[PDB]
Enzyme design. Structure first.
Site, short mmCIF file in Angstrom:
data_model
loop_
_atom_site.label_atom_id
_atom_site.label_comp_id
_atom_site.label_asym_id
_atom_site.label_seq_id
_atom_site.Cartn_x
_atom_site.Cartn_y
_atom_site.Cartn_z
CG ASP A 281 -7.14 -22.32 -42.13
OD1 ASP A 281 -6.78 -23.31 -42.44
OD2 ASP A 281 -8.35 -21.99 -42.25
CE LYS B 229 -3.03 -27.91 -39.24
NZ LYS B 229 -4.27 -26.83 -39.61
N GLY C 112 -5.85 -27.31 -46.48
CA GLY C 112 -5.11 -26.31 -47.21
C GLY C 112 -4.00 -25.97 -46.24
CG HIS C 113 -1.73 -28.26 -44.46
ND1 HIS C 113 -1.21 -29.38 -43.79
CD2 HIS C 113 -2.83 -28.13 -44.17
CE1 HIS C 113 -2.20 -29.78 -42.98
NE2 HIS C 113 -3.20 -29.09 -42.98
CD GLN D 65 -9.24 -30.99 -41.45
OE1 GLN D 65 -9.00 -32.19 -41.26
NE2 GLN D 65 -8.88 -30.42 -42.50
N1 GDP Z 1 2.79 -13.11 -41.70
C1 GDP Z 1 2.69 -14.58 -41.37
N2 GDP Z 1 2.03 -15.37 -42.24
C2 GDP Z 1 2.29 -16.65 -42.02
C3 GDP Z 1 2.89 -17.15 -40.97
N3 GDP Z 1 3.05 -18.60 -40.82
C4 GDP Z 1 2.35 -18.77 -41.91
N4 GDP Z 1 1.63 -17.92 -42.63
C5 GDP Z 1 0.67 -17.79 -43.58
O1 GDP Z 1 -0.42 -17.70 -42.95
C6 GDP Z 1 -1.29 -18.72 -43.55
C7 GDP Z 1 -1.52 -20.27 -42.89
O2 GDP Z 1 -2.47 -20.77 -43.27
P1 GDP Z 1 -2.76 -22.14 -43.75
O3 GDP Z 1 -1.50 -22.36 -44.78
O4 GDP Z 1 -3.96 -22.28 -44.25
O5 GDP Z 1 -2.39 -22.98 -42.38
P2 GDP Z 1 -2.15 -24.55 -42.22
O6 GDP Z 1 -3.39 -24.81 -42.85
O7 GDP Z 1 -2.14 -24.83 -40.94
O8 GDP Z 1 -1.24 -24.89 -42.97
C8 GDP Z 1 -0.72 -19.08 -44.90
O9 GDP Z 1 -0.90 -17.95 -45.79
C9 GDP Z 1 0.71 -18.99 -44.68
O10 GDP Z 1 1.47 -18.66 -45.81
C10 GDP Z 1 3.52 -16.33 -40.03
O11 GDP Z 1 4.31 -16.09 -38.92
N5 GDP Z 1 3.49 -14.88 -40.65
O1 IMO Z 2 -16.21 -31.71 -43.48
P1 IMO Z 2 -15.23 -30.83 -43.66
O2 IMO Z 2 -15.07 -30.41 -45.28
O3 IMO Z 2 -13.83 -31.03 -43.08
O4 IMO Z 2 -15.36 -29.31 -43.07
C1 IMO Z 2 -16.20 -29.17 -42.03
C2 IMO Z 2 -15.67 -28.01 -41.17
O5 IMO Z 2 -14.07 -27.92 -40.75
C3 IMO Z 2 -13.84 -26.66 -41.32
N1 IMO Z 2 -12.47 -27.22 -42.07
C4 IMO Z 2 -12.08 -28.49 -42.55
N2 IMO Z 2 -10.82 -28.22 -42.91
C5 IMO Z 2 -10.18 -27.06 -42.39
C6 IMO Z 2 -9.03 -26.63 -42.30
O6 IMO Z 2 -7.75 -27.37 -42.74
P2 IMO Z 2 -6.47 -26.98 -42.33
O7 IMO Z 2 -6.43 -26.27 -41.16
O8 IMO Z 2 -5.77 -28.34 -42.60
O9 IMO Z 2 -6.05 -26.03 -43.55
N3 IMO Z 2 -9.05 -25.62 -41.72
C7 IMO Z 2 -9.95 -24.82 -41.15
N4 IMO Z 2 -11.11 -25.20 -41.18
C8 IMO Z 2 -11.15 -26.36 -41.97
C9 IMO Z 2 -14.78 -26.35 -42.37
O10 IMO Z 2 -14.85 -25.19 -42.70
C10 IMO Z 2 -16.04 -26.72 -41.53
O11 IMO Z 2 -16.28 -25.77 -40.61
O1 HDA Z 3 -6.76 -24.15 -45.42
C1 HDA Z 3 -7.71 -24.67 -45.32
N1 HDA Z 3 -9.04 -23.97 -45.04
O2 HDA Z 3 -9.12 -22.80 -44.54
C2 HDA Z 3 -10.39 -24.66 -45.46
C3 HDA Z 3 -11.18 -23.61 -46.27
O3 HDA Z 3 -10.66 -23.08 -47.24
O4 HDA Z 3 -12.32 -23.29 -45.83
MG MG Z 4 -5.15 -24.01 -43.80
#
Ligand code: GDP
Ligand code: IMO
Ligand code: HDA
Ligand code: MG
EC number: 6.3.4.4
Length: 431
Positions: A13, A16, A40-41, A224
């Protein structure tokens, strides 16, 4: 470099999806190499939001070909659902998506097993995403998992599926005392989309080899985060795949020597979702501030993310494991307003020793304490800023300190969720 890797340096999170979507403007391919739909990207284009799970992040760009590598555990149900939602929004997924026949299949029973186990663990649960990620990975290594290739011969598939399922149902009812997953249903459900999946099969490793020899720009999209790595993360509070750079080669088929640049997505404060060690975790006002301001909620499960300061000790484990070439500092804007901001530069071990190296397995992080350096925050708004010049000095200082402590340059800086609220100081594709 032609082949650039974008991965999470913390616990996922970090951002990416955004950074991949941003930099794939020049890319030919985008490759997911590990994980499944636990990811969840989130992408945000001109305010319009898209959260991808199994589908690669280059899918919104018609110039790019999205590929799901053999390392990914693929859920036909998940795939179709995502595919439908994107198509209804005008993204011709099937025209842009390709996948590996070597991808293990995540089927219904995997989710049951996951739920069963998660319950069995009671208070000591992992906090998994509720899909059947780990079980799918088990089967694979266990020599009994179904792969996409299997879908190519339907009778044989039925045979293989009955066996594995007899196996799984036995332990589900007898050992776990949980309900059995019906064979006929899983078969029917799966056979319904078999053809759509099959139609997107390509020999991924031969493709990347060809792409490489031509100098095509390829992007690998991580899932992750580093500390969630099956081998190197906080075992057993981890995901069941290698989230570290080594997974690009195992999960895609591209020779390790062809990775040109490794970009580490670094959040600016830390979040963690699921159980597990988190030295810098904050339970006070600022932790709450970090969560609200950063809208820190699982892009997949929706549960609230734990938050804390940026851990330089933990990040440095990431620098070395992934041979980082550079960092992408994200969420900087979320710190606007804090009177002061701090970052962990060392760990105090339960036996009094001061250390700048992280423990490995979860148990070994037990009474570890963070030692912070403390910097002045900034009242100015950095949101949407796209030029260092618009950043206040404290911020620039904070950035510099991170580079100093880690010894890796911050090549890109993100000041907001939209694709454009970003500054690229050095483009990974030109490095
Ligand atoms: N304010 C802010 N939000 C950001 C930035 N980059 C990403 N986001 C938001 O922060 C979160 C990134 O979380 P997530 O999408 O789960 O990250 P990911 O899983 O690596 O792709 C999402 O809500 C993005 O829309 C940033 O520079 N600033
Ligand atoms: O067996 P699983 O279902 O994979 O869960 C195992 C563990 O890893 C964490 N987890 C799994 N995918 C994650 C993710 O994906 P992205 O960053 O790509 O958005 N971002 C954050 N935490 C994540 C889960 O919360 C739990 O701790
Ligand atoms: O963006 C994906 N993660 O935060 C996994 C979750 O929702 O627990
Ligand atoms: Mg995510």
């Amino acid at each position: 470099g032609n082949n650039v890797v974008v991965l999470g340096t913390q616990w996922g999170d970090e951002g990416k999806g955004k950074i991949v979507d941003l930099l794939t403007e020049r890319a030919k391919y985008v490759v997911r190499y590990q994980g499944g739909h636990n990811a969840g990207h989130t992408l945000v284009i001109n305010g319009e939001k898209t959260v991808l799970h199994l589908i690669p992040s280059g899918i919104l760009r018609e110039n790019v070909t999205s590929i799901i590598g053999n390392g990914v555990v693929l859920s036909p149900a998940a795939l179709m659902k995502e595919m439908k939602e994107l198509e209804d929004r005008g993204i011709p997924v099937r025209e842009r998506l390709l996948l590996s026949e070597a991808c293990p299949l995540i089927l219904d029973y995997h989710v049951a097993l996951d739920n069963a186990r998660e319950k069995a663990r009671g208070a000591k649960a992992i906090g998994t995403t509720g899909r059947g990620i780990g079980p799918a990975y088990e089967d694979k290594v266990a020599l009994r998992g179904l792969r996409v290739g299997d879908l190519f011969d339907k009778e044989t598939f039925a045979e293989k599926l009955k066996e594995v399922m007899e196996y799984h149902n036995f332990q589900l009812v007898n050992y776990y005392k949980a309900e059995a997953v019906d064979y006929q249903k899983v078969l029917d459900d799966t056979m319904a989309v078999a053809d759509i999946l099959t139609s997107m099969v390509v020999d991924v490793s031969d493709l990347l080899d060809q792409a490489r020899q031509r100098g095509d720009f390829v992007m690998f999209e991580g899932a992750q985060g580093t500390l969630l790595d099956i081998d190197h993360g906080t075992y057993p509070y981890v995901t069941s795949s290698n989230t570290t750079a080594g997974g690009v080669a195992t999960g895609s088929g591209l020779g390790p020597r062809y990775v040109d640049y490794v970009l580490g997505i670094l959040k600016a404060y830390s979040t963690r979702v699921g159980a597990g060690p988190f030295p810098t975790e904050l339970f006070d006002e600022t932790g709450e501030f970090l969560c609200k301001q950063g809208n820190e909620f699982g892009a997949t499960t929706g549960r609230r993310r734990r938050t804390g300061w940026l851990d330089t000790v933990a990040v440095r484990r990431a620098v070395q494991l992934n041979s980082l070439s550079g960092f992408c500092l994200t969420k900087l804007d979320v710190l606007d307003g804090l009177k002061e901001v701090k970052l962990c530069v060392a760990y105090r071990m339960p036996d009094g020793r001061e250390v700048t190296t992280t423990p490995l397995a979860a148990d070994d992080w037990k009474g570890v304490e963070p030692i912070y350096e403390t910097m002045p925050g900034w009242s100015e708004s950095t949101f949407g800023v796209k030029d260092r010049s618009g950043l206040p000095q404290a911020a620039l200082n904070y950035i510099k300190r991170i580079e100093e402590l880690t010894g890796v340059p911050i090549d890109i800086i993100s000041t907001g969720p939209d694709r454009t609220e970003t500054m690229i100081l050095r483009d990974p594709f030109d490095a």
